Amino acid sequence: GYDRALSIFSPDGHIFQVEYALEAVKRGTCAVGVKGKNCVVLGCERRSTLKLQDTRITPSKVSKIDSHVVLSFSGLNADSRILIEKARVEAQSHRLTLEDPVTVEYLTRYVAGVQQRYTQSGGVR
Amino acid sequence: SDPSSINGGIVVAMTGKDCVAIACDLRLGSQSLGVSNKFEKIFHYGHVFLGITGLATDVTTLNEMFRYKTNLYKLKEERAIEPETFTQLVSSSLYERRFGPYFVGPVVAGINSKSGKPFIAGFDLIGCIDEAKDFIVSGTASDQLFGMCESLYEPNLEPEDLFETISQALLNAADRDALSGWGAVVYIIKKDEVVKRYLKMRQD
Amino acid sequence: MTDRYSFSLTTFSPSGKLGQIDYALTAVKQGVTSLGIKATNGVVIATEKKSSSPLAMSETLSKVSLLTPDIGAVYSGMGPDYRVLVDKSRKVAHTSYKRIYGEYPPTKLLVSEVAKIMQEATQSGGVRPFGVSLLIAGHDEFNGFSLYQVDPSGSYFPWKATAIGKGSVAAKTFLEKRWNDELELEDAIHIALLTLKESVEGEFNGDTIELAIIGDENPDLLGYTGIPTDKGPRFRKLTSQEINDRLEAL
Amino acid sequence: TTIVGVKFNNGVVIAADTRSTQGPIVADKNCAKLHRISPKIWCAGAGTAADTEAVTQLIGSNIELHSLYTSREPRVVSALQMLKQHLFKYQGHIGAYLIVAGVDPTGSHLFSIHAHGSTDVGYYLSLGSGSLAAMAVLESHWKQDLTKEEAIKLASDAIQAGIWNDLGSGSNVDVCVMEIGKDAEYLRNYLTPNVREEKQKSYKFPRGTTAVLKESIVNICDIQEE
Amino acid sequence: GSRRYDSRTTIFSPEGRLYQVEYALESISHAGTAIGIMASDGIVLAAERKVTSTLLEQDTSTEKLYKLNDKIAVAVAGLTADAEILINTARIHAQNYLKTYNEDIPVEILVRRLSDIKQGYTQHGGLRPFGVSFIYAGYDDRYGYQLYTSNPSGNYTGWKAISVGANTSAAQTLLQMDYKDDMKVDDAIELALKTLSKTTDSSALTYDRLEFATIRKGANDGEVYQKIFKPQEIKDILVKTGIT
Amino acid sequence: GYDRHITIFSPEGRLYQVEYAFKATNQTNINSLAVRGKDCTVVISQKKVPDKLLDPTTVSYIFCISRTIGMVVNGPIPDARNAALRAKAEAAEFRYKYGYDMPCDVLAKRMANLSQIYTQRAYMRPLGVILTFVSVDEELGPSIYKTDPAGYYVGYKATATGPKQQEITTNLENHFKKSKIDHINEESWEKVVEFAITHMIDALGTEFSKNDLEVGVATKDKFFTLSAENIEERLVAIAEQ
Amino acid sequence: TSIMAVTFKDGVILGADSRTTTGAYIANRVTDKLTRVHDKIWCCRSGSAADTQAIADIVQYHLELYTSQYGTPSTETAASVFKELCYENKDNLTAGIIVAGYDDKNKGEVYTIPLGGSVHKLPYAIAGSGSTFIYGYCDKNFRENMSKEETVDFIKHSLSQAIKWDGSSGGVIRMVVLTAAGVERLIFYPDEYEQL
Amino acid sequence: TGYDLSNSVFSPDGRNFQVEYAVKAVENGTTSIGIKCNDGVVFAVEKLITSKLLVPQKNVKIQVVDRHIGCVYSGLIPDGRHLVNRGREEAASFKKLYKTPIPIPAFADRLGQYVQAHTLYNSVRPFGVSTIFGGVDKNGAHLYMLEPSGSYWGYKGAATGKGRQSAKAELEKLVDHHPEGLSAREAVKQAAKIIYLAHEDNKEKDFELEISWCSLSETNGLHKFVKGDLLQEAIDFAQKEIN
Amino acid sequence: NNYDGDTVTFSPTGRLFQVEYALEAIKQGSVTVGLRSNTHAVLVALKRNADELSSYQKKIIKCDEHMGLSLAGLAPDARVLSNYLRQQCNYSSLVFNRKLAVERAGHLLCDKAQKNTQSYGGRPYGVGLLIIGYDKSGAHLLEFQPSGNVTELYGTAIGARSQGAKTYLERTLDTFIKIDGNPDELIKAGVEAISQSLRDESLTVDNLSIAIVGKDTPFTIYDGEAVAKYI
């Protein structure tokens, strides 16, 4: 298999591939989250460079992970789908073994863990 | 215990003048218990017809499998599969499970769309091909069907005559089998029309 | 040891070119001329036997190869690459078709399988593309006669007539003026021999020209009687003598 | 199943009966027990019918590829080595007992191959439930330097012994002749000694005899335009 | 060792772009133009074959329009050989879904799968991405008629009308100008041909340089028909719409 | 310029590593020749022992692959022995699987196909050797088939390999132009070896002692190499006419 | 199956019957149980026809490849390759093999490999179902350094008795003579050896 | 250029520069020799005494393979040990299958094919040793020398390391002055002399002599080290010849 | 220069730079001494602290009852190689009821280090080891270099300023080899030897580390107030 170390340290103690991944996020459409006293709201930007779009079927920016947790994102759309799928699978796996849905903190810790693993694994960006 | 006689049921296929006929009973059982009177055993992939007797889970699985395979065939070949080619595909598919076989008795029937030639074939559970001129029999009343077909059958019957012959072959064979019956279907197949008839029979 | 080249050796350049495919096509251009012409009742494929030495026995090197009884192939470019593609093409006709459907694959589907092998050398780890273009001529019951070209990229196109390698640009112009939809096979062989003479410098005879047809069934070449539905191969390689006879009526 | 192989002056002849049985029931009255591995290499197969066809088509396919690779007509010893090594690997679980014959650049050959992977050489061989009936005729009438006409006679007589005296064998005689420097001739239903006599009665029914609940047209055609 | 010769196909630029994806998109911009237009009563797929010859056999040729199942078709822009690898994968996913659920695969589920395969070639494996962009035209009983596109990045989006390949900038402006929501299939056929006619790099648009297909409920009663147009049928619609 | 280090296409459509492997071929500075008789195939090769400390009996570039097939190599000995061991393995496996002796032309094709793979796969380098295979094949009769680092192979009436191949080639070309036949019309292999040595002397313009040559002979059902004393008997017959 | 290998002054002779049985039915009455693994190394096969044929074919391959690399193998080397296959696959094989060969250095040598996969070098060896009936006869009549004519008589008389008493043995007596002079095949028909 | 940075790369000459660089490491090593005698072979090697703290006779360099083959090498000592370990596996597998101890020519090709394999790929480094080895088999005595390229031949005498030119000259004299042959006991004495004469290239540090032999008459065709009185006798003979 | 990018590359003069760079890590490491008589074998090690708040890095590792080593260089690499020696010592005891010979222990360490110098991807070990032991042929001292070169010596030293201790032992060779049946005097000679490699700093109670093995003495390490006797 392809084993090449793509995420490595530089002389100034930086991991450039991780820093260049943040530059992809900077390019992504704006996403905002605000929590009230008894609710949370997720606002998302849709760039108006694309008209003649079918808004019925186009992937929506906010995704349900379970009936009680949602995930929005900024950055590479294709990359987000891989994190959403893994999260939705882990949500049903937690329900199946612990007999209780995930806490928002747990689901977060899981996704962040996946993101971390892809910064010190061979052959992956 | 014997997988080929848990669920029960029969298929018979015959050739006539510029036509073929294929027919099945509708029974599904758990040994002595009758479960369903609507379990059809004849399927079609375009103009090619496949009857399957034996273990019902395998009947369902193999139908789902040959639908899958003939669908991809049509997309790549840009034409419907022919009876002669399908026969070879059934044989291949069964033999790849040589040491863990599907417990089934498949029967192919159809007319070659180019040559117009009537075609039938039978198989054992590991895919050996019997390509008979006259008739093919399969299932828990195969002995009874061999007896009916061997006396009732004559070559070059017209479609409406062939219907009476195969119907009487199935019905009377089914009535001497504990695990077959509970209704019956007969397909009469010509080059560009197919008639499907449900038969009235005793429900015991 | 281990193959530690698990990464692509063919990548996109800033201009959107795939360098190694372009360079492979350059190798094909340097190769000896080969052509194919489709008639109403057959197909002809032909090439020059460019002999490396006169001490060499050019009959032992086959540029025109049987793939199935009804499909033949000829090439321009790197001969060794062609030889291993012919081996893989013959095997894949059995493993992914005849062993499943009990009949030989139709022309377009076998071409598709060869194309797939050539595409994988364009994307898989630690390999260069194949340095050949193939012309594949064949017959099958439901599609009739057909002629296909296959390039190092894996791309394939159907042709009425075409040429590849050294003098392809000049040969394709010659074919455009001569080709019509009412050609008999003998007419297409005559045109094939005329077209190929322009690109050949030295000797032009049955010993220096390799030519095969996809035509009528040859029961004499089947090797057994007694099965009416087996009438024999449609692929026939013309003899040294058979070529020389048609060079007198040239 | 009754299969024989007989060697003659300029070739080898192979013959078989045409009956397939499930227990005591005759499943097929016109079974083909003669398989073509290559144009000039045929074999007769006894045992599991799916196994005899499968094993001859697998080796037959590999032989064709080998023939193309080496630019040489296939050899019987090649088919033999490939069949025995395959059957030995599967320790007899592939139930194929074959008489392998043919002509090649080396001459004419006759071998037998058992399901466990043992091979035998011989001038005359027979396999199957009818082998003892067939081998009795071969042991009584075989001589060195048989002609082609004599060998077809001896081979088909040995199968007839099986048809009549063996319950596992019946119906017709299939023959294949492989002569040196000649196309192999495959004589399907060479003899037809068992045609059923006319029945006493016609069992053609009057129309409308069967009771019918429902009729409908089946849509075999694709989804239509407009 | 081997490290010396590795192009590293799955890395970010300092600007946070994927080099090989960007260069693959540059490749696709030189491919023949493909257009999809979605109407109330069906979908149109039109595509331009690249500079053909008089000796190309057109009636048996297919480089642009492929059938995935009886309800979904794609228009290809980029490396044909790369597209065929992905097309055969999509055809298998459709039949896997049908075998499992005994229902035809919803269009978006098939599009997401193919798009996820493309995404993988950008994040791991060290291989070059697929040099292909698809227009997916399909129907299912949840969302009805649907148009999608996917590109080498593995990103996909939905459209009322869209173009891929050469001159998409010019093509998208012309579609944005003449497209309306209450439009019908016959109208959409005319728009698709008029758009190619103006954006083409060829001197004139003729039947031999086009591939054309429609997905209509124009199929006797409550079902969907796919029509891949024959050379003579493309010639007829070119005379009808008044382009030749 | 890494397109010159591994087996990938240059902008000209060339494989430089293949071309450089051909150049390694001549590193030993040894010339070989192969001719066909009626009943036999003869291969001769120069033998050079520059060091007095070497055991001259162990210095050889002719290999007995099978009972029927002989192989002479033009190139360095490590790559020669690599190719020899593989050909021996391939010829033995063939006999086991297919029940007859591997033909000379089929072994050549297999070894050439192996060579083709080293030109297409980056991790494997080409072998810097040219393999000349000789036999009396039971179907084709006397046979010469030659393989190179490009993966090319072809049959030969006669052939020559090494630094001075062109001189030997033209010498043989001219002989076959006169006789107008594909072989040496001679009954005994002894006289076909005498022809081979004579025409190498004429082409290279050098005289040979018994220790300066190395000879291999293929007959029906065996290939064998001559001893120094068997060559000396050959050299005496040439000098006496 | 009755088979034996005997060493004499000029070399070694292998003897065998020609009968193969399926129960009481004689499948083959002209079987060759003497098989060549090298020009001057042969073996006698007892047990499963399939197993012994498969083993012999692998040994013939191993000694062909040995010859290509290291020249002519010793009889001891051939016996070792037979032993390796028989011992390492003892659970799945039924093969009793007598290995017989002629070197110029070592002259005639005989090695027997019973079911276990053990090796035993002997002046002569007997094996197969028929061998049980001739242990007495062979032990009383074998001498070292016999002539060719004496050794052919010893084997002929021995296998004649083995065939007489064992239903599993019969047909012709085949023999193979291994000397410096080369390889001679002999055959002896029932009418000859039954009247001894 | 860049053709010398990666192993298995052909230069425009047709040379593998990484193999040629390995030879430089060999040339940098201490002197080692082999002498083929009437019924066997003698091996000897120069061991540089870096310090008084080195325990005499303890850091043994010559290695035995099976019971009948001797191996000695010049260059990177660990690389030599790695090659002998492989040699011992090859000789064990040969004896396991074929019963007879591996013949010397057969053994030579086993090392040869293994060393050649380390010139086929850029993922591995060539061997930094030339190896002189041999012993007695059924066909008599055999001496071999094996280079980093995988090249090996049979030798009457062999030498490698820093003092190889000096040694080769002395070996060439013995071949000329003894065409009928040299005895095993004679070859042990001559081996001592040639190492002492070859020590002029490494004259800065004093050294320790180490000899081994296989002889059909003197050791029953087994590999043994020269020890005690016979070693001292060969040292005395060597010391007498330099003065 | 161009030939130091990995361990698989020879220089034009036939050098392996990655190995020579690994050899450099040893020179940067703290000094350790080894010396033996006929009866006993001693290791003396100068331990290095990070600062005044920190502990002194341990230099001596036990491998068996009859064998152990001192390290100089990358401590994690010493942990890998000492763990490998513990296993090989253990395998010898369990399978053959046999204490592993010190010479055979050297041969195993050599062959383990070699594999890392000939293969792509890996790196040489960055540590040097002094192995002492008492086996069936008496007392032994070995020096291991990560090149693969293992050498049997009467005495030696490795690390920074090791040349001073190595000269002292070269002078004292005839004296300390004769210290039989007197462990205290043999350690005194080792402490006096390592003193020749000190500058500015002197041997304190938590600074010094001593180990001994001998005829009727298991491999034992002395640290803290147990070495105050020898200061």
Ligand SMILES: *C(=O)[C@@H](C(C)C)[C@@H](O)C(=O)N[C@H](C(=O)N[C@H](C(=O)O)[C@@H](C)CC)C(C)C
């Ligand atoms: C013949 O071998 C079979 C045909 C190929 C269909 C069929 O006729 C059959 O099963 N025959 C059986 C038979 O001959 N079996 C023999 C046997 O058992 O002797 C084979 C199984 C060989 C072992 C008859 C019905 C017993």
Ligand SMILES: *C(=O)[C@@H](C(C)C)[C@@H](O)C(=O)N[C@H](C(=O)N[C@H](C(=O)O)[C@@H](C)CC)C(C)C
């Ligand atoms: C003879 O061994 C066999 C021939 C090679 C075909 C065959 O005749 C046979 O089955 N022989 C059996 C036999 O001798 N088996 C031996 C034995 O009894 O010693 C095995 C045990 C292996 C030594 C007869 C039929 C028992």
Ligand SMILES: [Cl-]
């Ligand atoms: Cl191959």
Ligand SMILES: [Mg+2]
């Ligand atoms: Mg009933």
Ligand SMILES: [Mg+2]
């Ligand atoms: Mg009831």
Ligand SMILES: [Mg+2]
């Ligand atoms: Mg390469």
Ligand SMILES: [Mg+2]
């Ligand atoms: Mg008897």
